[PDB]
Amino acid sequence: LQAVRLYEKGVILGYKRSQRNQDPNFTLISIKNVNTKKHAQFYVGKRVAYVYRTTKHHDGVKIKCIWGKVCRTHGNSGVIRAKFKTHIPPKAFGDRVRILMYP
């Protein structure tokens, strides 16, 4: 009906990480229908929006977005690394991101 989406859904997994060590400059993101490195390479360079709600208004709006970008793939199973303007908080692990169709 209304509110076209034209973006691919993704989920914020943890940070770029080893066992017992974190690199919260990158975020691991899982994209909806991608399960392979070759397919994940497709959405490289696309902008990513972490859109989330907030208890009280900040510009007359209850919603704000953390902007980032897909930088490269991660592993073999279509997980990507995203670099955001600011490190997304670990409270957002498991939340939804938009892999936008632009650029």
């Binding site: 859904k9 989920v11 997994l13 899982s30 909806k32 670990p90 692990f93 498991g94 939340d95």
Partner: protein, 201 residues
Amino acid sequence: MYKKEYVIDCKGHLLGRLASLIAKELLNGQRIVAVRCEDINISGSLYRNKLKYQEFLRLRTNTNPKKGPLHLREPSKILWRCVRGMLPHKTYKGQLALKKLKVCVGMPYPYDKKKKYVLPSALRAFRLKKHRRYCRLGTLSSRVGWNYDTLVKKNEVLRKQVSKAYYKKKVNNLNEKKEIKTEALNLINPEQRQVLENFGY
């Protein structure tokens, strides 16, 4: 992973593989509901797994067994404990992941009327060579002290009868819809019919 909730028919799955897949899904944030936990399979003979559970039962804090490892005998709880062992349950995020999981024996009222999914990388039929021994979780639980196996079985046969009635009605409705569609396919304009025929509709 991207659904509001995934209902998994645990019949015929291997316990450890099912638990691993469920644990990863819960940590990634997917709510899953595991039904028919009494039909989970474990590789290895029933006697061997019974010995394993006896070793587990012999385990308790000798100063106060109330504090000890709570053993739990319902197969749904056995699956829940396995998933928890595959999980970082002592952190806040791990606890959230653990509490995103619901386990049932049989198929209760909401979940008997929703689509049940299956994990191919955890069916016994795909993961065990036929000439090797396995056990049924409900049977192990009954030998260990659950004594609700037969009740779940009869509830399941009643549910299967209800489901068969539903399936007959659904098949008849599908045939009726197919006939209506095939009649209507000659009433649309030939360009639309041609497009549908070309793309397989």
